[PDB]
From a paper:
The crystal structure of MsTLP1 was determined using the single wavelength anomalous dispersion (SAD) method. The final R-factor and R-free of the refinement at 2.7 Å resolution are 23.3% and 26.1%, respectively. The polypeptide folds into two distinct domains: an N-terminal thiolase like domain (residues 1–407) and an additional C-terminal domain (residues 435–507), with a 27 residue long linker connecting the two domains. Thus, the N-terminal domain is organized into a five layered α/β/α/β/α structure characteristic of the thiolase superfamily. The C-terminal extra domain (residues 435–507) is made up of 6 β strands and resembles a barrel-like structure with three anti-parallel β-strands on either side of the barrel. Electron density is missing for four segments consisting of residues 17–25, 64–77, 135–170 and 253–254 in the thiolase domain as well as for the N-terminal hexa histidine tag. The six protomers in the asymmetric unit are related by a nearly perfect non-crystallographic 32 symmetry. Therefore, the hexameric state observed in the crystal structure of MsTLP1 is likely to be the result of crystal packing. Static Light Scattering (SLS) and size exclusion chromatography experiments show that, unlike other thiolases, MsTLP1 is a monomer of 56 kDa in solution. The most significant difference is that the active site nucleophilic cysteine, Cys89 of the CXS motif of Z. ramigera thiolase, has been replaced by Gly102 in MsTLP1.
Residue numbers in the entry: 2 to 17, 26 to 63, 78 to 133, 168 to 252, 255 to 507
Write the structure that this text describes.
């Protein structure tokens, strides 16, 4: 190795009401202890703290652990951020920038798409998920089975994870069967498949030179062997609403950087608030959904607990532990990412190497050069349903549609028409003809 090469040396998790500072503090204290050196000496050596977004929250965490770092960072929103952050400080440790960095996050118990209803995460993921159902040509009930078969192995791992907050294990049948208890929320998801905790996570990272200076046992060092960060264009510009090629590209580029192939990976933690971003990696990569290696280390999002923002740092922590236990093997972490907007991948191993710079910037500019699908904001005429969702938590039930015209440009529409909503809830709408009427609040729709 080169002395500037970055290693993860300490990881920390905590579950418990404590403040969000207090929770990140508890996890940070465990990261400092995990490294096997004197915590206080390590704390004095920290030059940067970075926190994920939930006052100076990163400096309060620092004061609490005995650190006085020159830089404090408050990162941008999104589930990609823990892994984006680890990659960014890896790179800066590799150059002449930083030497000891602490990353942490926590959570407490306490445009033209906006005006159409796309405000929360679930309704928007519904559209992507129904778009993937279109491309695969699966029926509604068939797809619902696929989702339950993907997620049941998740909740099993989740139930044996002590860091999981109040988890019950669920069978495939239990997830797929609509009851008064497991009722339809947003199409196509039943309640048990989408669902508040106290938890903190921290990562301690260093140059190999700082690890020796500070007295950190070598059996604790883990390398970030591969990495990539990718980004999609806004939802209605995407070539296929049912896929995210940027996520797959990130995975493949991170694989290249490590010098390995998909078969060489021993363990996966794939980000899973909804089935889609998991499915999507599987579709573009060849990885089977029932792969014996497993697709989660943590148990995943519905089941593990949490809002979604700081989830992947628990992933990274589990990856790092699992890799110390199986020295020489490789672990992939995937972090999502808005409305499948962002994806960040890290591959971890005890096997040493020099930091390899990734090709994300040039891969991003290639994907940015792809043609964008055209949008008609004020659509007036006859169109085809490309994808849809329904809000079952509203009365009357409310449909959101992305459509196509004859022109081939996309639009959005909202609908409470009793006739149309019956087709979206109880049948198979893809491709059905509808008539859309413009309006500056929402475009409305009805059958043809």
């Amino acid at each position: 190795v080169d002395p500037r090469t970055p290693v993860i040396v300490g990881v920390g998790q905590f579950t418990e009401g404590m403040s969000s500072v207090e929770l990140a503090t508890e996890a940070a204290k465990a990261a400092l202890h995990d490294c096997g050196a004197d915590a206080d000496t390590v704390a004095r050596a920290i030059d940067t703290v970075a926190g994920t977004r939930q006052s100076n929250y990163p400096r309060s965490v620092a004061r609490n652990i005995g650190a006085d770092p020159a830089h404090a960072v408050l990162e941008v929103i999104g589930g990609q951020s823990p892994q984006h952050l680890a990659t960014e400080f890896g790179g800066k440790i590799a150059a002449g920038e930083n030497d000891v960095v602490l990353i942490f996050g926590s959570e407490n118990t306490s445009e033209y798409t906006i005006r159409h209803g796309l405000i929360g995460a679930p309704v928007q993921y519904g559209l992507l998920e129904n778009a993937r159902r279109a491309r695969l040509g699966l029926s509604v009930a068939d797809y619902r089975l696929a989702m339950a078969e993907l997620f049941a192995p998740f909740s099993k791992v989740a139930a044996k994870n002590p860091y999981s907050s109040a988890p019950t294990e669920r069978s495939v049948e239990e997830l797929l069967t609509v009851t008064a208890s497991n009722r339809m929320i947003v199409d196509p998801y039943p309640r048990l498949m989408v669902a508040q905790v106290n938890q903190g996570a921290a990562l301690l990272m260093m140059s190999v030179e700082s690890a020796r200076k500070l007295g950190v046992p070598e059996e604790k060092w883990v390398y970030l062997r591969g990495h990539a960060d990718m980004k999609e264009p806004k939802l209605l510009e995407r070539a296929d609403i049912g896929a995210s090629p940027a996520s797959v590209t990130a995975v493949n580029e991170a694989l290249r950087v490590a010098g390995i192939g998909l078969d060489d990976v021993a363990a996966f933690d794939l980000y899973s608030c909804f089935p889609f971003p998991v499915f999507n990696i599987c579709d573009g990569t060849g990885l089977a959904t029932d792969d014996p290696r497993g697709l989660t280390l943590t148990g995943g999002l519905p089941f593990f607990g949490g809002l979604g923002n700081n989830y992947s740092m628990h992933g990274i922590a589990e990856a790092v532990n699992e890799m110390r236990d199986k020295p020489g093997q490789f672990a992939l972490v995937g972090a999502n990412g808005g409305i499948a907007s962002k994806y960040s991948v890290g591959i971890y191993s005890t096997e040493p190497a020099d930091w390899v710079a990734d090709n994300s910037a040039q891969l991003q500019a290639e994907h940015d050069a792809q043609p964008k699908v055209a949008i008609t904001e004020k659509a007036d005429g006859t169109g085809t349903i490309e994808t849809y969702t329904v809000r079952y938590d509203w009365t009357p039930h409310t449909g959101i549609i992305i459509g196509r015209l004859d022109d081939g440009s996309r639009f959005l529409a909202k609908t409470k028409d009793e006739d149309l909503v019956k087709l979206l809830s109880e049948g198979d709408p893809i491709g059905a003809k509808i008539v859309v009427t413009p309006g500056e609040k929402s475009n409305r729709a009805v059958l043809a």
